[PDB]
Structures are given as structure tokens and as C-alpha cells.
Structure 1
């Protein structure tokens, strides 16, 4: 009862990738796949199911809001042009790989013109209908031909959407939208399947999206009594949105949590936190119990890898 469709095999990793301004030069590594690791790298992948011989897949940067829109940042590298990646695939293989994909960080002052130009290409071209742009004449598809006379009135609509969207635009997060195409009777790739959107990709350079990490600390132990001062070194955090949490998984789906004591003034230049230790689950205990410590961002509950902390009796 189905038909040919596009499936995202490997999703792009969500955190840790650095977006790049054009002044930083081309290529600084391509967006990693969620499975990629240390010395064994991987990349985002799509698979055209219920095959269709040759096919050409494209990728676009869409926003992350409720309303999937066109982002102002661009994709660059390998097979890209105007922030759109276009790759061929399908002779025999139906799994496309996407290495060498970089995210060009557009400038702030720059976002309005880029968005207007990027959307204008869409109204005129026959890629994705009046979805990513605005609820209107969503025709001008890949049905008849590829190109449309931008009416005088239509231009006002793009400008208005561009102005509204620039304000909504979040330059720290972005999403990938894959669109596949199957050959025409003429051999042309016009047969458009359904678009698929990927997980949100956060800019590792954004303080709020920064991947948290405990770089080094004073001591890794203290008395269950708590109240001892600690000196912790970490990656960039925001003084008003950071907390140090201690915890130990308890018997039978249980978990005790404790919070380091400190004020935002104790956060030094975004890179260090001097705090006092919380009191352990129960004062008077038998022998040294070990727990875990972790930085945690309030606003989104994101966390750093845990680091062992040893509690000992008084």
C-alpha cells in the first residue's frame, strides 16, 4: 500500500559541531553522524527505500521552530551551491553518505538579505512548495517546468516573510531537510518523494548550546557532612544557568541527587566555579561511598559526562 520513500539511516550528531563564518575559510571538518566517534568517524545517512534506480537527493538547512522554515545559515563543501547540497545516487546503491558537510554561520546584519534571497530562490524554483516560505500560492512545483515569473505582488510577500522570520531566526540551532528525486521519462530528476527532517543541530560555539565538560577539580572527595569548598575548571558556561549536581543511582530504580552550593558570582569568567559540597544522603555511614558529579545547564537540563566523587564519613 506504500510507495518509494526516503529514510534517515544515521542522523547527524546534535552537539559539538562548530558552525563557521566565511572569514574562517572553507572546510574545518564536516558535520559528524550521531554514531561517529574518536578515531572511527561516521556521517549523516539517508536511504531511498522501495528503490528507484538512479536518483538525486538534496539537503537544505531548515529552522528548528514549530513551523519548519528556511534557515539563513548555509551548507557548504563537497557538493554544495547556494547552501543546498545536491548529490546523485541510486544506480545500484540506495544509501547516500554525507561527509564534508559544513554549516556556514551567516552574520547577523547579513541574515535578512540572505533569507530574502534564499526564499526568493524557492518561490521561483521548483524545489519545495510554499511550505518553508509562506502559506500562499504553493504551486510552481517540479510538475511542469522549473522557473516562475515573480509577480510584483508576490515580491512584497517574500519581503514581509523575510522581515518576520529574521526576528524569529535562531542562529545557534539548525536542521537538515532531505529531499529525494526519481528520474523522469526524459531521464530527468523531477519525481519528488516526501521530505524528511533531521534532528536539531546545535552550534557548539553557542554558550547556551555549548557541550558541558568538567575539565579539572580541586579534590574528588569530601566528608558526607558537606560544606567543603571546591575549585572546579570547566568549559564555557553561563553564570546564571549552571549547576553542579551530585548523584548516585539507588537500589531499585532509585536516585539520590545533591547540589553544589554557590552563587553566580562564584562563576569565574565563564570558565571556573568555586563552590561548597552538598551533604550526602545520610550523615553517619559505614565506609567511603562514591557518587558522581556533573555540570548541568538549568534552562535545558543538558549535562556533562559524570566524574567520580568519593564521600567519606566524619
Structure 2
């Protein structure tokens, strides 16, 4: 097959989701390796054609089978909850740079679904029986629809492909994990130290404090009633896998999430005697 390939996947974290009341554009979407300096945008590649036709982008649930989604895509060449333009005959390398996510309100859900049905907005034209399930309105996936030409001048339509799942930063249970301030950055190795920490949004339930050394796992101890307003954690430092020590040695302290396992920035922590 002349086919469809995804190269710049999208930045799963680091983005928030905006409603009908928050500017009809919401900037654009970054690529997984975008970082302000070398700031890139999501792209695809086509192998076995370079010429005219059509490109479409729709929105599908994370977990399969992948239904259309009750959320909308807004900006350039965008309409009816997707993006439609005309493919560029120049190359077979493609970038989408004015791209938005609009989230729809949980009562407007059924309306949205109806609209999608009306459109035929469904890559994997699934039955309207299973299109009942339950919905994920944190997480969205990207699906690609393409029409080209055989060496006659018909239209020809290709295998539709999936992206890394894309997440909401205002959203609590899938927010990007950051550590903002701290109360110290070195106590004794013996463990007992109690530490005051200020962070981006975190939920008290699913959340630990995680330490890694040259092979070594420790967890530092606190109850869901030490978590003050979801942005503050108070804990006790687990002793070292070597109580005796003597020198100073330095490790890593992070925030994990037992369900998905996503890790914060790492901040440097040092261990002492007496």
C-alpha cells in the first residue's frame, strides 16, 4: 500500500482544554519534541504518493474500539468537529499548526453524539449499539483520513492510523506533574525528616513520593489527610538502603501516579550523618 505514517506525535501533557467561552481558538497543538527553542508541530508522511486530494482529522476515544468523540476541533479549516482541508500537491510531508480542542459539556454530550452521527464523523463507522459505553473526557486520540488518485484519476482512500493519547492539564487525574517549591533539600539518611512541598494540581488518593538510586526503590510516608488542598504534601523520608552511610550522597525525588505511572520533573536530594 501507499500508506500513512506519523512522525511528530503530539505533546500528551503540557496542554489544556478550552470551552466555547474561552476564545474560539486555543492556540495550537505542539509535537512531543517541542520545547520553545526547536518548537515543532504535529506531522505526517506519505510513502507512495505526492500530489492532490484531501485530508481529514477526527477525534476518537482513547480506549477501543475507537468511537467518534463528543469534543470539537477549532481554528483553521475546521468545522463540524473536525479539520478538513485540501491536501498540498507540493510534498508528502504535512504539518498542522493552527489546532484546537474544545470540550463539550456533559449534558450536551448526547447532542454532540447525535451531530457526529449526522455528519458520518466516524472513521471506523462502528455500530450505534456499542457507541453507548462509557466516555473518557480527559483523553483524546487522532485519526487520519485521506483521498488520493490511482494512475487514472479516480479517488482512492487509505489505512487510518492512531496517535499517542492526548491529555488535559486543567484536568485533575491526568495533569502534568510538577514540583514548585520545597522546605529543605537535605536531611539525615536515617529517615525521619518531614518535608513540605508545593506543587501543580495533584489528587490525594493516587499519588506517592518516589526515590531512585543506582538500583533502589523507596516511598515516603503520609496519609490522604496530610494532603492540603491538593497542592501540598507533608511526609517522612524512608531510610536509605544503607543506614550506616558516612559521606554525602545524592539521589532523586519525584511524583508518581500508581495507575498510569507518569513522573514529574526530578529535584535533587542529598543525605547526611547525625
TM range (shorter): over 0.9
Which residue of structure 1 aligns with residue 35 of structure 2? 37
Pairing partner for 2:204 from 208, 225, 239: 239
User: How far 1:89 sits from its partner (Å)?
Assistant: 2.7
Query: Secondary structure at the residue paired with 1:200?
Result: coil
- Work out whether 1:169 is the aligned partner of 2:135: yes
User: How far 1:185 sits from its partner (Å)?
Assistant: 8.6
Q: Which moved more, 1:179-188 or 1:91-100?
A: 179-188
Query: Secondary structure at the residue paired with 1:116?
Result: helix
User: How far 1:184 sits from its partner (Å)?
Assistant: 7.6
- Work out whether 1:229 is the aligned partner of 2:229: no
d(CA) in 1 for partners of 2:163, 2:232: 34
Larger helix percent: 1
- Work out whether 1:48 is the aligned partner of 2:13: no
- Work out whether 1:307 is the aligned partner of 2:267: yes
Which residue of structure 2 aligns with residue 293 of structure 1? 253
Query: Secondary structure at the residue paired with 2:166?
Result: strand
Query: Secondary structure at the residue paired with 1:75?
Result: coil
Aligned CA distance change for structure 1 residues 226 and 132 (closer, same or farther; 3 Å): farther
Pairing partner for 1:203 from 153, 164, 168: 168
5 Å-filtered alignment, 1:11-30, equals 11-30=9-28
CA contact (8 A) 1:262 1:276 kept: yes
TM-score (norm 1): 0.83
Q: How many residues align?
A: 274
TM-score (norm 2): 0.94
CA contact (8 A) 1:119 1:133 kept: no
Query: Secondary structure at the residue paired with 2:110?
Result: helix
4+ runs deviating over 3 angstroms: 183-188
From the CA coordinates, give the structure whose radius of gyration is larger. Answer: 1
Residues 54-101 of structure 1 show CA distances to partners (whole Å, capped at 9, x for unaligned) of 132111001111201101111111111111112323423111101111
Which residue of structure 2 aligns with residue 275 of structure 1? 235
Query: Secondary structure at the residue paired with 1:102?
Result: coil
Aligned CA distance change for structure 1 residues 186 and 78 (closer, same or farther; 3 Å): farther
d(CA) in 2 for partners of 1:234, 1:210: 11
User: How far 1:186 sits from its partner (Å)?
Assistant: 9.2
Structure 2 residues without counterparts, runs of 5 or longer:
none
Larger strand percent: 1
5 Å-filtered alignment, 1:1-314, equals 3-122=1-120, 128=123, 131-134=124-127, 158=128, 164-165=132-133, 168-183=134-149, 190-248=155-213, 250=214, 255-314=215-274
CA contact (8 A) 2:181 2:199 kept: yes
Root-mean-square deviation (CA), in Å? Answer: 1.9
Residues 192-247 of structure 1 show CA distances to partners (whole Å, capped at 9, x for unaligned) of 11111111111112111001111110001110001111100111110111111111
Query: Secondary structure at the residue paired with 2:245?
Result: coil
CA contact (8 A) 2:50 2:91 kept: no
d(CA) in 2 for partners of 1:233, 1:13: 24
User: How far 1:119 sits from its partner (Å)?
Assistant: 1.8
d(CA) in 1 for partners of 2:69, 2:256: 29
Structure 1 residues without counterparts, runs of 5 or longer:
135-157
d(CA) in 2 for partners of 1:230, 1:28: 38
CA contact (8 A) 1:291 1:310 kept: yes
